[PDB]
Amino acid sequence: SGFRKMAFPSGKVEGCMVQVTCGTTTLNGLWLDDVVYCPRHVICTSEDMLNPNYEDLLIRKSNHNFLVQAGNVQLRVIGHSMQNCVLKLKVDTANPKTPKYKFVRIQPGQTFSVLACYNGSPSGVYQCAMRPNFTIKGSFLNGSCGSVGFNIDYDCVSFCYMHHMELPTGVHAGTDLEGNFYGPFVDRQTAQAAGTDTTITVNVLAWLYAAVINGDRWFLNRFTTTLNDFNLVAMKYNYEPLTQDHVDILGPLSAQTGIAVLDMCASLKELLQNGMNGRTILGSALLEDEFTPFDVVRQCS
Amino acid sequence: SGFRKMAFPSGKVEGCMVQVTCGTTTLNGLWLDDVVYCPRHVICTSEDMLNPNYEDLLIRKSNHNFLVQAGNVQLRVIGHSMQNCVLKLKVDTANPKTPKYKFVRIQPGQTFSVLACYNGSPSGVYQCAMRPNFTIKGSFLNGSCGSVGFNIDYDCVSFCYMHHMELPTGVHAGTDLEGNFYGPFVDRQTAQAAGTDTTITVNVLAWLYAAVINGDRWFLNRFTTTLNDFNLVAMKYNYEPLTQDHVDILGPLSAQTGIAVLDMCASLKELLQNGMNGRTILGSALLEDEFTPFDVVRQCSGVTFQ
Ligand SMILES: CNC(=O)c1cc(Br)cc([N+](=O)[O-])c1N[C@@H]1CCCC[C@@H]1NC(=O)c1cncc2ccccc12
Numbered sequence: 040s041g042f043r044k045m046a047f048p049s050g051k052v053e054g055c056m057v058q059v060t061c062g063t064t065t066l067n068g069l070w071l072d073d074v075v076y077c078p079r080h081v082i083c084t085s086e087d088m089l090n091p092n093y094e095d096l097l098i099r100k101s102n103h104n105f106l107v108q109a110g111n112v113q114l115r116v117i118g119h120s121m122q123n124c125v126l127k128l129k130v131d132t133a134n135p136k137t138p139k140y141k142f143v144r145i146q147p148g149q150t151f152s153v154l155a156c157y158n159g160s161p162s163g164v165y166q167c168a169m170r171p172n173f174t175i176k177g178s179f180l181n182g183s184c185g186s187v188g189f190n191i192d193y194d195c196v197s198f199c200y201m202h203h204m205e206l207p208t209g210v211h212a213g214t215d216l217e218g219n220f221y222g223p224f225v226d227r228q229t230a231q232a233a234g235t236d237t238t239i240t241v242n243v244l245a246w247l248y249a250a251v252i253n254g255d256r257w258f259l260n261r262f263t264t265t266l267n268d269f270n271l272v273a274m275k276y277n278y279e280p281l282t283q284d285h286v287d288i289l290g291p292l293s294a295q296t297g298i299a300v301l302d303m304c305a306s307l308k309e310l311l312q313n314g315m316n317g318r319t320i321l322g323s324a325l326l327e328d329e330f331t332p333f334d335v336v337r338q339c340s
Numbered sequence: 341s342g343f344r345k346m347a348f349p350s351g352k353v354e355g356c357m358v359q360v361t362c363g364t365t366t367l368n369g370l371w372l373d374d375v376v377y378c379p380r381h382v383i384c385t386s387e388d389m390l391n392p393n394y395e396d397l398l399i400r401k402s403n404h405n406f407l408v409q410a411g412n413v414q415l416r417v418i419g420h421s422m423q424n425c426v427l428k429l430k431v432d433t434a435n436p437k438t439p440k441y442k443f444v445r446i447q448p449g450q451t452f453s454v455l456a457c458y459n460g461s462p463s464g465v466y467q468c469a470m471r472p473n474f475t476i477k478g479s480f481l482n483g484s485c486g487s488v489g490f491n492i493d494y495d496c497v498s499f500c501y502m503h504h505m506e507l508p509t510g511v512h513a514g515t516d517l518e519g520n521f522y523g524p525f526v527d528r529q530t531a532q533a534a535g536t537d538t539t540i541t542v543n544v545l546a547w548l549y550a551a552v553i554n555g556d557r558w559f560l561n562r563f564t565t566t567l568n569d570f571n572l573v574a575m576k577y578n579y580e581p582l583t584q585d586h587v588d589i590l591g592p593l594s595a596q597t598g599i600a601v602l603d604m605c606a607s608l609k610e611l612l613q614n615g616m617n618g619r620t621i622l623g624s625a626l627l628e629d630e631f632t633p634f635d636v637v638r639q640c641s642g643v644t645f646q
């Protein structure tokens with residue numbers, strides 16, 4: 040028992056972290072097989088960032104203009120290309136520590152583990168959720184670009200995020216590993232306000248099921264609601280509307296606990312309307328929305 | 341910016357995790373050089389657990405009763421011994437992925453990362469604190485015994501915890517890597533109770549400094565308090581007494597923020613008495629006590645590891 044914010048073991052990703060330097064600009068890269076992936080803004084100077092022409096900036100660089108270092112050892116570049124917002128550097132050798140991997144584009148509300156790196160060396164590993172406004176509330180400092188987010192399934196690493204920037208509100212924005220940004224953000228130094236965020240309804244429901252599994256059941260009530268009646272309450276408290284696909288994804292947790300999803304929604308409605316009255320759920324005084332149903336299943340059997 | 345419950349990179353420890361099977365029992369072992377360390381209760385049947393005599397039960401086993409697998413490679417056991425509550429199995433082959441390591445016994449309130457493993461496979465990593473009652477509030481299922489907790493200094497892994505059991509109240513208990521339990525617990529299926537816990541004060545102060553570093557300042561005030569006056573309020577709300585040593589280790593965070601420790605203590609005193617008035621600190625409606633001053637510095641300055 041117990042329920043913790045748990046990241047995947049980072050070893051398989053650590054073996055892929057390199058340093059990428061173009062001019063004086065240096066950030067982290069992801070070395071998989073014979074390709075190194077990193078944010079394309081490594082080819083920009085600070086003044087370039089205000090209004091970059093990435094296609095022009097790329098021709099004025101060359102294979103020799105890229106300095107890739109794997110553990111203080113330099114790698115040699117044999118090719119350069121740009122796919123959306125990621126730079127791809129073909130190198131001399133396939134990484135011998137390349138894990139079984141895929142590139143995936145996650146949906147908002149899905150979670151993943153981030154390996155925060157600086158100069159190609161890891162600082163820490165933590166769990167994040169792709170927020171409905173396509174930011175993530177990460178922990179990143181200057182030099183962290185190129186750090187990646189990932190999930191690990193039975194020995195295959197699914198890379199889903201590469202870090203590009205911190206917005207003025209302190210949240211983070213990035214691309215998938217094909218270089219397409221999550222959300223409407225762009226790799227330019229310009230006003231880009233993230234839209235207002237919302238609470239991930241299905242994740243909050245997943246976490247309440249985790250609480251019931253761990254013995255917290257004071258919030259269960261005898262009432263029920265419909266999907267439409269619940270969604271009227273959700274919009275009032277800035278919760279994502281609940282869909283039938285979300286109900287189905289909670290099916291495993293509803294079956295293990297015997298609590299129907301729309302019954303749990305009735306419990307959630309009361310929690311939104313009345314608060315918690317000085318109680319906690321899984322040690323939290325607030326409703327937690329960065330655990331997916333699959334995150335709950337993994338820890339809660 | 342941002343502040344997360346952040347674990348160490350686990351790769352170095354992942355390379356040491358093996359599976360240990362004795363009879364119908366399988367749990368995790370830690371393979372360092374040519375030795376595998378694991379909970380000694382792997383030699384017990386369920387009936388043995390009610391009142392085991394480990395010295396007798398170990399005399400009754402042999403090298404061949406132990407099946408050790410590192411991934412898909414079987415390792416052959418050439419010796420078995422017991423050091424307190426840990427079993428030590430000498431194997432023919434040294435782990436080529438053995439990192440620089442030490443075995444340390446941590447103090448209550450200190451933090452570490454747990455690499456949750458099952459059948460020798462790492463499943464997840466998270467940060468936890470050694471609670472003042474010498475339990476940890478972990479996330480563990482059946483088969484997790486032998487999972488280890490650790491810290492990393494540059495390239496050296498300091499192992500400090502090996503998981504042995506879940507108490508009936510749902511918290512977790514274990515040993516250092518010399519086999520000595522943290523707390524008054526024993527590896528026996530018998531009535532056992534953890535003592536009453538307290539809040540780790542120096543960690544709450546560290547976390548408040550992390551909040552200021554991240555721009556949360558609404559809880560700051562113009563007052564300062566004395567050590568004694570604070571401790572009078574702290575002990576009344578089940579907080580650990582604040583010591584001069586705790587003030588000194590908070591020094592870097594105090595200097596980086598320009599907020600004196602006893603100045604922050606005035607904020608903590610008001611927070612303990614009055615709550616947050618519907619506000620949050622680093623996204624939490626409660627005071628967090630599982631970040632040490634060193635954890636805060638490591639995360640907010642970008643300390644890295646091999
Ligand atoms: C801060 N400002 C922006 O992050 C930013 C904002 C916008 Br709008 C657009 C871009 N853009 O287009 O690349 C940005 N990235 C910067 C531009 C050049 C390359 C990388 C730069 N950022 C980091 O190094 C960085 C990453 N993570 C957390 C941080 C925390 C503190 C300081 C810096 C970071």
Ligand SMILES: CNC(=O)c1cc(Br)cc([N+](=O)[O-])c1N[C@@H]1CCCC[C@@H]1NC(=O)c1cncc2ccccc12
Pocket residue numbers: 040381389480481482483484485504505506507508526527528529530531532
């Ligand atoms: C649950 N019960 C106890 O864990 C327990 C309780 C007491 Br009282 C004493 C011991 N003791 O003496 O070892 C215990 N360990 C068990 C006995 C034999 C060896 C390993 C056993 N535990 C696990 O497999 C385990 C570990 N962590 C979380 C779990 C969650 C659910 C189920 C099992 C676990």
